[PDB]
Amino acid sequence: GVDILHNKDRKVWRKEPKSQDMYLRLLVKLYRFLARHTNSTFNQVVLKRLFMSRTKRPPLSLSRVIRKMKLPDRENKTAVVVGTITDDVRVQEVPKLKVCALRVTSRAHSRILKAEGKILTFHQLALDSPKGRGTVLLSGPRKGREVYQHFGKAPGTPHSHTKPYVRSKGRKFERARGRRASWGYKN
């Protein structure tokens, strides 16, 4: 008889990806090895991110990689994205970048390689830098999804600016009793 609570003794994180795609599952084998063998904490973070869901590794736009590599003391450095690199159409000038991504969108490939850029895969990144030296590891915005507007404090509960789940937006779809001083009360 020991007074332990077993409620939280099982840690609920990912040991492996849920996916059965082999090319990712070979990149995991490569970073299973590099993570635990190299002293680099970079490889630990890349391995950890190869497990994560589509939603946990959101797409990083070309323009954020433009922006986040314009930052000082970051010149001649490889931009590592464990998610995907999407083209941003509201950016005109694109510099020469060194990029690692699982996916680069065909319009963003064209855009980066035309600007004298180089595109790597995680297999090349290992051979280029096994310990992940000379890298800027970036992530897309994870509160990017519309899903996160519906989350937090329930709408109809004062100072909650939480999007309600409404069938269709208009002038007679949840605008009256809980929304106005005129139609009863306002939160």
Partner: protein, 49 residues
């Protein structure tokens, strides 16, 4: 497009690029070790005091 272009991670992992930038393999296996007493086992006592 390919997610990785060199699938052969025999040749990747044993490339000098990577083999340089590892720590040494800890291949020595450590089984449990039996407790012996103070007043019972004389040379187990001599190993500690």
């Amino acid at each position: 497009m390919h997610k990785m272009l060199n699938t052969d991670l025999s040749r990747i992992l044993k490339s000098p690029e990577i083999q340089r930038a590892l720590r040494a393999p800890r291949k020595k296996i450590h089984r449990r070790v039996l407790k012996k007493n103070p007043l019972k086992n004389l040379r187990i006592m001599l190993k500690l005091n």
